[PDB]
Design a protein around this ligand. Sequence first.
Ligand SMILES: [N+]
Length: 107
Amino acid sequence: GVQVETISPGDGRTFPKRGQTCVVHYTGMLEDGKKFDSSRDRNKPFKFMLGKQEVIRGWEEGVAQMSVGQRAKLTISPDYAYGATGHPGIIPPHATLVFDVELLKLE
Ligand SMILES: [N+]
């Protein structure tokens, strides 16, 4: 599933609801610490609508447990990420992924 560990607290009150647009900054790494993607390197927050399956399941479920302003580390099993096939050339088969995610605002 997805394990959410707080790095820095949010407001503890405003949680994302289905249909809302989450604006986040994130860094994705493989289990060994190798970074594969990051909005921070592009200096542009990423937006996605909760509930439209525009992102991996681990995000849909993990970000929903975060409050606005919170920074958290999400550890995601392959079944909630890219599964057995992964994404050849980027994400290996059966990969557990770790994400450093900061929820900036909801639109
Ligand atoms: N996949």
